[PDB]
Amino acid sequence: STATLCLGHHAVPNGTLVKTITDDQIEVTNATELVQSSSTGKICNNPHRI
């Protein structure tokens, strides 16, 4: 004679931590690196004529 409706969001197996103002460390469902650390080690002749 009654029904229950609920709302919610998704989740992932193992999330990633991020640095935020309020919390010193917290996990999210997705992240991304904003600092290029890797390098091919070779100079690409193009476009700039080398």
Binding site: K19, T22, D24
Partner: protein, 49 residues
């Protein structure tokens, strides 16, 4: 509470704690606790160059 038995007060440590935790750690995060520097540039002179 203002029940028939009278009045009374009690602080909820749970809620209070959450606030404190967020507050404390933030400062150090935003600003780096420290950074070293040694020989730099003369930031003063006595004559014109």
């Amino acid at each position: 509470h203002q029940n028939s038995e009278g009045t009374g007060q009690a602080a909820d440590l749970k809620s209070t704690q959450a606030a404190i935790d967020q507050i404390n750690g933030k400062l150090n995060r935003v600003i780096e606790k420290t950074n070293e520097k040694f020989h730099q540039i003369e930031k003063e002179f006595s004559e014109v160059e």
